[PDB]
């Protein structure tokens, strides 16, 4: 939902920061500096549309496949925790 010079992140955009939507400026963690991000794809909405369920627009078939890699197959590390504290 936003990438980098070489990396990615994720964020739901409001109405107020619609200007910064296409390309941002942010701290790229695969670096130590602010670097301009892009908008590789959508991941939902910041609020409800009238008369519609919680996931009115739906994230995507795409941004889900990005999620199913981040959370997804964590089977490398249910060790050190699963959801507990």
């Amino acid at each position: 939902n936003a990438c980098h010079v070489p990396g990615d992140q994720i964020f739901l955009v409001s109405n107020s920061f619609t200007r910064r939507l296409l390309t941002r400026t942010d701290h790229c963690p695969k670096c130590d500096r602010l670097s301009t991000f892009r908008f590789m794809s959508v991941s939902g909405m910041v609020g409800r549309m009238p008369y519609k369920p919680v996931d009115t627009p739906g994230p995507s078939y795409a941004t889900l496949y990005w999620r199913k890699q981040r959370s997804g197959k964590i089977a490398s590390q249910p060790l050190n925790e699963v959801c507990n504290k």
Binding site: C3, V5, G7, D8, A62, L64, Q69, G72
Partner: protein, 140 residues
């Protein structure tokens, strides 16, 4: 894409914002002009015309790279009309000259193509989000 058929976009012919979370699609560091061979600024700029020919790999880790001013036909030295070029032995040749034809001067702008910069003209095609089976979605 995979997008079996009848699911791709129809009126503009292509979906906006090719999501590419599978492979990040960044400009490489060992990058260089195909036509000129001078190293290219990493990513801070749109002085380079980055043609990622879908998945390319061979021209560079990603697709061919050209500074906006090295994007001319090498043999005839004018612009690449309608931007279809012909990679002749690692020096982009104009299709008409590279094809044997000889009409060797255009009308509008001679030594600089009409091209877009940094793939912005090449993102009408190639590698939309579901670039493969990608069934990891609905499987458990």
């Amino acid at each position: 894409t995979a997008v079996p058929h009848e699911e791709a976009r129809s009126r503009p012919h292509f979906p906006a914002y090719t999501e590419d979370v599978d492979q990040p699609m960044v400009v490489p560091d060992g990058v260089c002009c195909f036509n000129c061979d001078k190293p290219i600024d990493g990513d801070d700029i749109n002085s380079y015309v980055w043609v990622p020919s879908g998945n390319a790999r061979v021209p560079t880790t990603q697709g061919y790279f050209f500074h906006v001013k090295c994007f001319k036909c090498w043999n005839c030295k004018y612009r690449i009309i309608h931007n279809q070029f012909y990679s002749k032995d690692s020096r982009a040749w104009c299709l008409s000259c590279a094809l044997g034809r000889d009409i060797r001067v255009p009308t509008r702008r001679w030594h600089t193509s009409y091209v877009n910069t940094h793939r912005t003209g090449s993102r009408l095609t190639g590698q939309f989000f579901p670039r493969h089976r990608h069934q990891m979605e609905f499987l458990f």
